[PDB]
Short mmCIF file of all heavy atoms in Angstrom, two decimals:
data_model
loop_
_atom_site.label_atom_id
_atom_site.label_comp_id
_atom_site.label_asym_id
_atom_site.label_seq_id
_atom_site.Cartn_x
_atom_site.Cartn_y
_atom_site.Cartn_z
N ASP A 1 0.89 -1.20 0.00
CA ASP A 1 0.00 0.00 0.01
C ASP A 1 0.86 1.26 0.00
O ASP A 1 1.84 1.27 0.75
CB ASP A 1 -0.92 0.01 1.25
CG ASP A 1 -1.98 -1.02 1.14
OD1 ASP A 1 -2.21 -1.66 0.11
OD2 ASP A 1 -2.70 -1.09 2.18
N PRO A 2 0.57 2.26 -0.87
CA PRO A 2 1.30 3.53 -0.76
C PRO A 2 1.00 4.23 0.61
O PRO A 2 -0.13 4.18 1.10
CB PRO A 2 0.79 4.26 -1.96
CG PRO A 2 -0.55 3.80 -2.14
CD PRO A 2 -0.49 2.35 -1.90
N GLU A 3 2.00 4.79 1.24
CA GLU A 3 1.86 5.42 2.57
C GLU A 3 2.04 7.00 2.34
O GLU A 3 1.12 7.69 2.81
CB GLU A 3 3.01 4.95 3.45
CG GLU A 3 2.92 5.39 4.92
CD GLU A 3 4.15 5.11 5.75
OE1 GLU A 3 4.78 4.12 5.53
OE2 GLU A 3 4.49 5.93 6.62
N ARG A 4 3.03 7.44 1.76
CA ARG A 4 3.37 8.86 1.73
C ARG A 4 4.41 9.14 0.61
O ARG A 4 5.35 8.40 0.44
CB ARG A 4 4.03 9.32 3.01
CG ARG A 4 4.20 10.71 3.26
CD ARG A 4 4.86 10.89 4.60
NE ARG A 4 5.01 12.25 5.06
CZ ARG A 4 6.06 12.99 5.00
NH1 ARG A 4 7.29 12.55 4.51
NH2 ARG A 4 5.99 14.26 5.44
N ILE A 5 4.14 10.21 -0.12
CA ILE A 5 5.24 10.67 -1.08
C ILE A 5 6.20 11.52 -0.29
O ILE A 5 5.74 12.46 0.41
CB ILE A 5 4.55 11.40 -2.32
CG1 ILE A 5 3.89 10.39 -3.14
CG2 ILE A 5 5.70 12.07 -3.01
CD1 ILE A 5 2.81 10.95 -4.12
N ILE A 6 7.47 11.30 -0.48
CA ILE A 6 8.42 12.06 0.35
C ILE A 6 9.35 12.93 -0.42
O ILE A 6 10.12 13.63 0.11
CB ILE A 6 9.14 11.07 1.38
CG1 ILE A 6 10.00 9.99 0.57
CG2 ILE A 6 8.15 10.41 2.37
CD1 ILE A 6 10.50 8.90 1.47
N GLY A 7 9.14 12.96 -1.79
CA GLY A 7 9.88 13.81 -2.62
C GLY A 7 9.49 13.64 -4.08
O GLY A 7 8.85 12.64 -4.37
N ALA A 8 9.79 14.60 -4.90
CA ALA A 8 9.47 14.60 -6.31
C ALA A 8 10.76 14.92 -7.13
O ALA A 8 11.45 15.85 -6.70
CB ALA A 8 8.28 15.41 -6.54
N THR A 9 10.81 14.36 -8.32
CA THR A 9 11.97 14.72 -9.24
C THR A 9 11.51 14.60 -10.70
O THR A 9 10.89 13.56 -11.07
CB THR A 9 13.20 13.90 -9.10
OG1 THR A 9 14.13 14.39 -10.00
CG2 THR A 9 12.97 12.40 -9.28
N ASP A 10 11.83 15.63 -11.49
CA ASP A 10 11.58 15.56 -12.92
C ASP A 10 12.81 15.65 -13.76
O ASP A 10 12.83 15.96 -14.95
CB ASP A 10 10.60 16.65 -13.42
CG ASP A 10 11.14 18.08 -13.31
OD1 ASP A 10 12.22 18.29 -12.76
OD2 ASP A 10 10.38 18.97 -13.79
N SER A 11 13.98 15.28 -13.19
CA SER A 11 15.30 15.34 -13.78
C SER A 11 15.33 14.37 -14.97
O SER A 11 16.16 14.66 -15.90
CB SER A 11 16.41 15.01 -12.68
OG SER A 11 16.39 13.54 -12.46
N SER A 12 14.57 13.33 -14.99
CA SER A 12 14.46 12.48 -16.16
C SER A 12 13.68 13.07 -17.33
O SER A 12 13.71 12.52 -18.45
CB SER A 12 13.85 11.15 -15.79
OG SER A 12 12.47 11.24 -15.62
N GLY A 13 12.97 14.14 -17.07
CA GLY A 13 11.98 14.70 -18.06
C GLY A 13 10.54 14.25 -17.86
O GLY A 13 9.64 14.72 -18.48
N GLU A 14 10.33 13.33 -16.96
CA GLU A 14 9.00 12.82 -16.53
C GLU A 14 9.02 13.03 -15.04
O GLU A 14 9.99 12.77 -14.31
CB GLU A 14 8.82 11.41 -16.89
CG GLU A 14 8.72 11.10 -18.36
N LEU A 15 7.87 13.43 -14.52
CA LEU A 15 7.71 13.81 -12.98
C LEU A 15 7.61 12.45 -12.41
O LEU A 15 6.77 11.57 -12.81
CB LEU A 15 6.49 14.66 -12.75
CG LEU A 15 6.29 15.00 -11.26
CD1 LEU A 15 7.43 15.81 -10.70
CD2 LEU A 15 4.92 15.65 -10.98
N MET A 16 8.47 12.20 -11.35
CA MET A 16 8.45 11.01 -10.53
C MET A 16 8.29 11.38 -9.12
O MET A 16 8.86 12.42 -8.71
CB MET A 16 9.66 10.17 -10.82
CG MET A 16 10.07 10.09 -12.22
SD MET A 16 11.18 8.73 -12.45
CE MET A 16 9.89 7.43 -12.38
N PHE A 17 7.66 10.53 -8.32
CA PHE A 17 7.53 10.70 -6.87
C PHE A 17 8.33 9.59 -6.22
O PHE A 17 8.21 8.37 -6.62
CB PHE A 17 6.13 10.57 -6.40
CG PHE A 17 5.18 11.65 -6.83
CD1 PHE A 17 3.97 11.35 -7.49
CD2 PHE A 17 5.50 12.99 -6.70
CE1 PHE A 17 3.10 12.29 -7.95
CE2 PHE A 17 4.61 14.05 -7.12
CZ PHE A 17 3.44 13.67 -7.79
N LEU A 18 9.00 9.91 -5.04
CA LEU A 18 9.53 8.93 -4.18
C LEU A 18 8.48 8.43 -3.23
O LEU A 18 8.02 9.17 -2.33
CB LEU A 18 10.70 9.51 -3.44
CG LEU A 18 11.47 8.57 -2.59
CD1 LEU A 18 12.09 7.44 -3.40
CD2 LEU A 18 12.56 9.34 -1.84
N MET A 19 8.04 7.20 -3.51
CA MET A 19 6.87 6.71 -2.74
C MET A 19 7.36 5.83 -1.58
O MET A 19 8.01 4.79 -1.85
CB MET A 19 6.03 5.90 -3.63
CG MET A 19 4.72 5.38 -3.00
SD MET A 19 3.68 6.69 -2.41
CE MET A 19 2.93 7.20 -3.98
N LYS A 20 7.04 6.21 -0.33
CA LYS A 20 7.17 5.35 0.80
C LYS A 20 6.02 4.37 0.88
O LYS A 20 4.89 4.77 0.90
CB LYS A 20 7.26 6.17 2.03
CG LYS A 20 7.26 5.51 3.41
CD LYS A 20 8.54 4.62 3.61
CE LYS A 20 8.51 3.99 4.95
NZ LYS A 20 7.25 3.20 5.37
N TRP A 21 6.36 3.13 1.03
CA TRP A 21 5.36 2.02 1.08
C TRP A 21 5.13 1.66 2.56
O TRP A 21 5.97 1.50 3.36
CB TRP A 21 5.88 0.80 0.33
CG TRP A 21 6.19 1.14 -1.13
CD1 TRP A 21 7.38 1.30 -1.63
CD2 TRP A 21 5.21 1.35 -2.16
NE1 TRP A 21 7.26 1.57 -3.02
CE2 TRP A 21 5.92 1.72 -3.27
CE3 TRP A 21 3.83 1.52 -2.15
CZ2 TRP A 21 5.31 2.02 -4.50
CZ3 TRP A 21 3.14 1.88 -3.35
CH2 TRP A 21 3.93 2.05 -4.54
N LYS A 22 3.86 1.35 2.87
CA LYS A 22 3.42 0.91 4.11
C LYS A 22 3.99 -0.38 4.48
O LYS A 22 4.07 -1.36 3.57
CB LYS A 22 1.89 0.82 4.12
CG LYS A 22 1.27 0.87 5.52
CD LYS A 22 -0.26 1.29 5.35
N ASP A 23 4.45 -0.56 5.74
CA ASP A 23 5.00 -1.83 6.22
C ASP A 23 6.33 -2.16 5.65
O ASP A 23 6.74 -3.36 5.57
CB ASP A 23 4.01 -2.98 6.12
CG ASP A 23 2.78 -2.65 6.93
OD1 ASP A 23 2.72 -1.97 7.93
OD2 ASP A 23 1.78 -3.23 6.46
N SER A 24 6.99 -1.13 5.10
CA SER A 24 8.23 -1.34 4.47
C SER A 24 9.18 -0.27 4.72
O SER A 24 8.74 0.92 4.83
CB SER A 24 8.03 -1.50 2.96
OG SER A 24 9.25 -1.71 2.29
N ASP A 25 10.44 -0.48 4.71
CA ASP A 25 11.50 0.52 4.79
C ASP A 25 11.88 0.92 3.33
O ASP A 25 12.76 1.79 3.26
CB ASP A 25 12.73 -0.05 5.49
CG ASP A 25 13.44 -1.22 4.70
OD1 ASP A 25 12.70 -1.95 3.89
OD2 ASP A 25 14.62 -1.43 4.86
N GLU A 26 11.18 0.33 2.28
CA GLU A 26 11.50 0.66 0.92
C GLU A 26 10.75 1.92 0.43
O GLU A 26 9.62 2.09 0.87
CB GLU A 26 11.06 -0.57 0.03
CG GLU A 26 11.67 -1.92 0.31
CD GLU A 26 13.06 -2.11 -0.23
OE1 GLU A 26 13.65 -1.16 -0.79
OE2 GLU A 26 13.62 -3.26 -0.02
N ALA A 27 11.41 2.69 -0.35
CA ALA A 27 10.80 3.85 -1.08
C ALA A 27 11.38 3.78 -2.49
O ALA A 27 12.58 3.80 -2.59
CB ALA A 27 11.02 5.14 -0.35
N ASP A 28 10.52 3.83 -3.49
CA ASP A 28 10.87 3.72 -4.78
C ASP A 28 10.26 4.87 -5.59
O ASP A 28 9.18 5.35 -5.27
CB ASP A 28 10.11 2.55 -5.54
CG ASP A 28 10.51 1.21 -4.94
OD1 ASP A 28 11.72 0.96 -4.63
OD2 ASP A 28 9.59 0.43 -4.73
N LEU A 29 10.99 5.38 -6.61
CA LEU A 29 10.41 6.17 -7.56
C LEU A 29 9.27 5.57 -8.31
O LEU A 29 9.45 4.37 -8.89
CB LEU A 29 11.47 6.73 -8.59
CG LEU A 29 12.51 7.70 -7.99
CD1 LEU A 29 13.53 8.10 -9.08
CD2 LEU A 29 11.92 8.95 -7.36
N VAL A 30 8.21 6.31 -8.51
CA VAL A 30 7.12 5.90 -9.34
C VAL A 30 6.71 7.11 -10.22
O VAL A 30 6.97 8.20 -9.90
CB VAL A 30 5.81 5.48 -8.52
CG1 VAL A 30 6.14 4.25 -7.70
CG2 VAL A 30 5.25 6.64 -7.68
N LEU A 31 6.20 6.81 -11.44
CA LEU A 31 5.79 7.89 -12.32
C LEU A 31 4.58 8.60 -11.66
O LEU A 31 3.70 7.93 -11.19
CB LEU A 31 5.33 7.36 -13.66
CG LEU A 31 6.39 7.07 -14.64
CD1 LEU A 31 5.90 6.18 -15.87
CD2 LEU A 31 7.09 8.41 -15.16
#
């Protein structure tokens, strides 16, 4: 489950969010 977006970047030319996942220490970029 997504929990919180903790940052955003468009350095690739597409806007991506750093998504913190519930019950996880993992955060991944998502479009």
